[PDB]
Every structure is written in structure tokens, then in C-alpha cells.
Design a protein around this ligand. Structure first.
Ligand SMILES: Nc1ncnc2c1ncn2[C@H]1C[C@H](O)[C@@H](COP(=O)(O)CP(=O)(O)OP(=O)(O)O)O1
Ligand SMILES: [Cl-]
Ligand SMILES: [Cl-]
Ligand SMILES: [Cl-]
Ligand SMILES: [Cl-]
Ligand SMILES: [Mg+2]
Ligand SMILES: [Mg+2]
Ligand code: NA
Ligand code: NA
Length: 326
DNA sequence: CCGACGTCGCATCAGC
DNA sequence: GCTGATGCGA
DNA sequence: GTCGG
């Protein structure tokens, strides 16, 4: 937080462009600038100094000058005033509610936490759960609780089958002292890019996690992805821990490295790494890295034996998880 | 200029 | 039932 | 909103 004020302004501007203007390009632009400015080792002194950083053009440079001189931004001040803007922005904070659904509700007269409760009937399952744990999902998870959560997951997974390998990724693997949620990468030798020797692989795990009452709710569930809710167990007379979001991703074992790279993120890092990949003639996803033909066509998977192999193909120095928090 | 700016799983809808 | 677009999220 | 060709 050397330039915490500036990166917050741009983040607010990004959230506004995405939730209200439904303009993700302006969204990505602001996110990028906030990112590049967040890793800047100096205390920005002007818009011009910031403009030297890639991603900060003229418009943002001007906005930075204003912020520095007054400690605020009029454009955002007005946005905070506007009731529709603030209402939409607010509703998008409910898990499962996006710009579209937010603007729809405000068009129907639903614009507060109270309005959502007395209209639960208009929400799909996901939105209902996001509302039910609204306060809870707004809280950060101390690493200490992440560790206890890690332990429960790995151990409950081992009990279903010793061959399952569960790895906690996301901001946790990047070393954050706190996380917004828990992300779990799962692998089993019975599921490779060549065949699915077993069914209900993710199910069995989710099932066991529910059995021990760790997983409390489900937001969505397929054969390789599970998005839900979990809660650490508490002591006698001890207050309950908040419910937490939990994501599970089953990836073909032979595609592990590509999978853990993806799931470690951050999201912006992935976008940048993948963008850079395309310029170097490759395309990367959570399964593989394939070379692109002159006609823009995904070639066949390339051999990968480590995360570092992916960075090499694109000619990037390897970067430790703790340095991929862009 | 001014067009390009990662990738994909699941829930839901419309159309058939 | 299906496919395919869209919303929302990882 | 910013960038490179
Ligand atoms: N838009 C996107 N494009 C590409 N990859 C994306 C992505 N959103 C999420 N990911 C990937 C990388 C995240 O680390 C990882 C976890 O997704 P996540 O939403 O849990 C965010 P995380 O980075 O874990 O921080 P935190 O706020 O949860 O503590 O999923
Ligand atoms: Cl846009
Ligand atoms: Cl402001
Ligand atoms: Cl891989
Ligand atoms: Cl692939
Ligand atoms: Mg996370
Ligand atoms: Mg997550
Ligand atoms: Na710049
Ligand atoms: Na939301």
C-alpha cells in the first residue's frame, strides 16, 4: 500500500465500468493500471510519472493528478451520489448476482439487502446462497484458518482414496496472509486426458466433505468443478466461524502443471501470461500449452513436466507463486 | 488512427 | 430431450 | 482505456 489511494481509485473505477457501464474493456484497462501501479516501488508524484508505466495512458494520468491534488476524484464522487449506480454496484456484491441481474432488480425496485430478503423468490439457487451468507462472504480468511481448512480437506480426501492428491492453490499458494476463499486442485490417476477409468470422482470427495459437515452448501456442481460453502468446526461454547466460499477443481493428472499454474493465478497474472503466450505464438489454458499455426489454429499439446516448462516456452523467467500476485 | 486486449465450467434460458 | 447463446464465476 | 503496427 505505497500508492493504496491511487490503486483503490482505479479499482473503484474498474468495478464501476464492469457492474454499471457493462464495459469490460474499460474494466480490464483499469485493472491493469491498478496492477502495474501496485507493484511500482515508488510513491507516485504525478500523473506523468505514472504515465511512464505501461497501462497508464492519458486519461488515467489526468485522474491521478486530480486525486493527488485533492485526495479524491469528482467522477467517482458523482458515481457515489447516483442511486442507480450505487444500487447496482451494491447488488453485484451478492455472489451470483452480476451486472445484468443487478440492473434488472433495480429496474424492478429491488435495491437493498432488505429488498433481496423479501424477494428471495426471484433469486436462483446461487443468488439465494450468496444472500444467505452475504456478510460472511465479505470477510477475509486468516492464513491460520486456511491451514486448518487445508488439513481437513487433505485428510478427508485421503480417506476416500489414498491416490487422490489435493493441492490448495489461489492466493493461498501465492502466500497471502489472508484469502477471500479456498481453492482446491484435485487429481486422481484414474482421470487423465486419455480416459476416465472412474465416475463420480469429484462427487465422492464433495460427498465426504459434506458427510463430515465441512461443506455446507452447493453453488454449482459438475464433473470437474465444484463451487460451494464450507465452515470450520468450532469448540464448545465457542462462537461459530464464518461460512467460507470453497472451490474444487478436478484436473486430469497428466495435465497437473498447467492446472496448478492456472489455479494459482492470480487472475490478472493469468491474463497477462496468456496474452504474452499468444504473442510468442502459443495459447495456454488449464490443460495445456499449444503452438499456434500461421493461420491462428491451436496445434497439438506440448510436453510439460513442470510449471517452469510453461514459462520457458513463452520465454519468461520463472516466477515463484508469491510473485504472481498481479 | 483504430482494431485487438485469456480461457473455460456450470446454471439458465430460448429455440427446436 | 438437445444445442447454443448468455450470465456469472474460477 | 491503452497499446502497437
Ligand atoms: N478471470 C480469470 N482468468 C483466469 N484465471 C482466473 C480468473 N479468475 C480466477 N482465475 C484463477 C486464478 C486465481 O488465482 C484462481 C482462484 O480464483 P479466485 O476467484 O478464488 C481468486 P484468488 O486469486 O484465489 O484470490 P482470493 O481473492 O480468492 O484470495 O482462479
Ligand atoms: Cl469497454
Ligand atoms: Cl474518490
Ligand atoms: Cl501440464
Ligand atoms: Cl486443451
Ligand atoms: Mg481464491
Ligand atoms: Mg476461488
Ligand atoms: Na503508460
Ligand atoms: Na456478484
Amino acid at each position: 500500500t505505497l500508492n493504496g489511494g491511487i490503486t483503490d481509485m482505479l479499482t473503484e473505477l474498474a468495478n464501476f465500468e464492469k457492474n454499471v457501464s457493462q464495459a469490460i474493456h474499460k474494466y480490464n484497462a483499469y485493472r491493469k493500471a491498478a496492477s502495474v501501479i501496485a507493484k511500482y516501488p515508488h510513491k507516485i508524484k504525478s500523473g506523468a510519472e505514472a504515465k511512464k508505466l505501461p497501462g497508464v495512458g492519458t486519461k488515467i494520468a489526468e485522474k491521478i493528478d486530480e486525486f493527488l491534488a485533492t485526495g479524491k476524484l469528482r467522477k467517482l464522487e458523482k458515481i457515489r451520489q447516483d442511486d442507480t449506480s450505487s444500487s447496482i454496484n451494491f447488488l453485484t456484491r451478492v455472489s451470483g448476482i452480476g451486472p445484468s441481474a443487478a440492473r434488472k432488480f433495480v429496474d424492478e425496485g429491488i435495491k437493498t439487502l432488505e429488498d433481496l430478503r423479501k424477494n428471495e423468490d426471484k433469486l436462483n439457487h446461487h443468488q439465494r446462497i450468496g444472500l444467505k451468507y452475504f456478510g460472511d462472504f465479505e470477510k477475509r480468511i486468516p492464513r491460520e484458518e486456511m491451514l486448518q481448512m487445508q488439513d481437513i480437506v487433505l485428510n478427508e480426501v485421503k480417506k476416500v482414496d489414498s491416490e487422490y492428491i489435493a493441492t490448495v492453490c489461489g492466493s493461498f499458494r501465492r502466500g497471502a496472509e489472508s484469502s477471500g476463499d479456498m481453492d482446491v486442485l484435485l487429481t486422481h490417476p484414474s482421470f487423465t486426458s486419455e480416459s476416465t477409468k472412474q465416475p463420480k470422482l469429484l462427487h465422492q470427495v464433495v460427498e465426504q466433505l459434506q458427510k463430515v459437515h465441512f461443506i455446507t452448501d452447493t453453488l454449482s456442481k459438475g464433473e470437474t468443478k465444484f463451487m460451494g460453502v464450507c465452515q470450520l468446526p468450532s469448540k464448545n461454547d465457542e462462537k461459530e466461524y464464518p461460512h467460507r466460499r470453497i472451490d474444487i477443481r478436478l484436473i486430469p493428472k497428466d495435465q497437473y502443471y498447467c492446472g496448478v499454474l492456472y489455479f494459482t493465478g492470480s487472475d490478472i497474472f493469468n491474463k497477462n501470461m496468456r496474452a504474452h503466450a499468444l504473442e510468442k505464438g502459443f495459447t495456454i489454458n488449464e490443460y495445456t500449452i499449444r503452438p499456434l499455426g500461421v493461420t491462428g489454429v491451436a496445434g497439438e499439446p506440448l510436453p510439460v513436466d513442470s510449471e517452469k516448462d510453461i514459462f520457458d516456452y513463452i520465454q519468461w523467467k520463472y516466477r515463484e507463486p508469491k510473485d504472481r500476485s498481479e
